[PDB]
């Protein structure tokens, strides 16, 4: 009928050797589809329609304190296929920027419409935006960032997919 | 008075032992060391169930009583290395005393799980079972241990790390007996 | 649906010749399973789950007054397979000790959980403890002890076993 | 906030165990049997010191704590034979844990000593040391055991007697530790 | 007749090269006898009986901040000859644990009886416990710990020893 899930889950993880990662180097650009969240990924294989109530992100990077580069992150509510720059992430509401040893918190501005789980011909009805984390400095040592999520959603209309 | 065939036994208070105790404290669980280079993501540092044996003052006092019920139970991680390490860890608490959960996704999912770098210590406020368990061993594990602690590394540490997890327990042992371990 | 039985029934009976029965000699060690009580044995072949409300024991030994040994009894809420000594029965709540011509009353401390009737892989869910009656003296003549019970239980969830 | 060389260890409650417990109960001390004809006057039936080992639930709980202080301590004799025996006994309690008092005159002299026939049971309300002792063994005996129980026959019994002495103890173990016996 | 001394004094000092000192490695295990404290050592060669009023310890380790091991300490009021482990120090009241660059404060639970100064056949009457400081990590560089004390005592009954 109608549920209300919470959770906290890894979205993605990337590793960067030294020398790589000038300004504008995209570390991770992935849309918020149910296939990426693990516990919602098993729960959106049941239902059909969900609507996010609150949704927040944390970056949680892991490097020694002698790194001396930095990152920027944001949340773009166009799930298009072209925003690869610093200035699109500058404009948005709830963006963060810090050095590589510091964790910050993205409090985005989502859509609060009512979406679908499966794929379709239109992209705007199945994912409420994109996360983009791109390096702004030029790092010294190997970093290892591990972005988290904090999702709360209200899945309904029971079915079953065959992915 | 006069003299019968046998006077009755005057053992008055027989089998009237103590009933309710409250033991608290803090004791470690386990401790390991990892050389440099070893310890990629998913490498299990420590996985030891909370049986009353690993808490040492409780295990000498649960050999008397039969049943215990954990009132408050918290954990502290305390890694020991300078701020030039740069790997990380993830800690959790899984109330299954089963034998297959070895991934980052299972540990992050539970309630009150933490993740931090090797030069930073965190604190677990877990979701324990709050039931009333047994002390002696048996065939089924789900009645004698309120879960497992699993701690595993997530990065690739640079120097030698040295973690030492602890445990702040409080319990209310009752129903007196004495067993043989 | 839900019943409430009472009763009073023989658990076991043993006989001891002269010379036998030093201290620590087990006369009867049997768990409280429904197969031992007679009227509950016919009634727990119907239902599946029972929960004891009140349960008490009496020893009722029968010997002439020139016996001059004694016994101890108790109730151990571990239905394990190893407690054969005096000191495990010493510790428990509601133990008794008297000479062979005297009856005493065990008022135990049971579990008040909700158990099963049939057998299973785990022993703790099918029997709320053990009765142990062991001689503490070194008797003179032939005794004949006959322990009783006084059980009250609330059987439910109807089925039928095939023992 | 900013990033230092090493964050301080946040182990908050370390070494804050329980302090005061009160254990009571009843447990036997020893038990013997005497054939007919044996057991003239002065024959020692039972002579065993009250070390915490002979009380079995206390000995599994004094392996934690360091010091105990006996609050109340009483004894019950309970012989088992019919009224055709006609010998006797004498019971006492000597607060020396030494090793030479084997006569009727030493046992009758103490406070709260009893004497009766074999078909009658009595009760000892002794004069214990009421100090604050230790639990582990050492060179000196006078700091770890609050006296001895000595019971010996006084007549010449006719049939087989069978005595079974008991002990009603209550104690207040404290100052937590853990030893190795 | 009766005095009241205070003070602050070195108990012991040890040095540990790199590689040595795994978990359970005893750095210093010495009883609190008057022969170890310096100012009380000259004052307990006068009198015979003392009784500690307040007595506290500090660890004061000295190493660069890149050490990354740690220690544990405590106070065991058995002056026996066998407690060499972590778990005996875990149980006691007023134990401390920190990394090698950090000083902590032991506030023990002593005996407050009235003791002797000289040696004797029994150990329990001449020393109110033991200090045990043992490494719990596996250190990187050379540390140099220097434990202190803070003793206050009330010596009496004048005599003179010949050690």
Residue numbers in the entry:
A (entry chain B), C (entry chain B), E (entry chain B): 52 to 214
B (entry chain C), D (entry chain C): 34 to 214
Provide the authors' own sentences about this structure as they appear in the paper.
Here, we show that both transient expression of the coat protein of Atlantic cod nervous necrosis virus (ACNNV) in Nicotiana benthamiana leaves or in transgenic tobacco BY-2 cells leads to the production of VLPs. For a detailed structural analysis of the plant- produced ACNNV VLPs, cryo-EM was performed on the sample prepared from N. benthamiana leaves. Single-particle image processing was carried out in Relion, which allowed us to determine the solution structure of the VLP to a global resolution of 3.7 Å. The ACNNV VLP is an isometric particle with T = 3 symmetry, consistent with previously reported structures of the grouper nervous necrosis virus (GNNV) VLPs which share ∼85 % sequence identity. The shell domain displays the highest local resolution which allowed the building of an atomic model of the capsid shell. The viral asymmetric unit is composed of three quasi equivalent copies of the coat protein which have a characteristic jelly roll topology, with clear side-chain density. Three P-domains of the capsid protein interact and form spikes on the particle surface. The P-domains are attached to the rest of the capsid protein by a linker region and display lower local resolution, presumably as a result of flexibility. Overall, the cryo-EM analysis confirmed that the structure of the plant-produced VLPs is very similar that of material produced in other expression systems. When administered either intraperitoneally or intramuscularly to sea bass, the VLPs were shown to confer partial protection against subsequent challenge with ACNNV, indicating that plants can be used to produce effective vaccines for use in aquaculture.
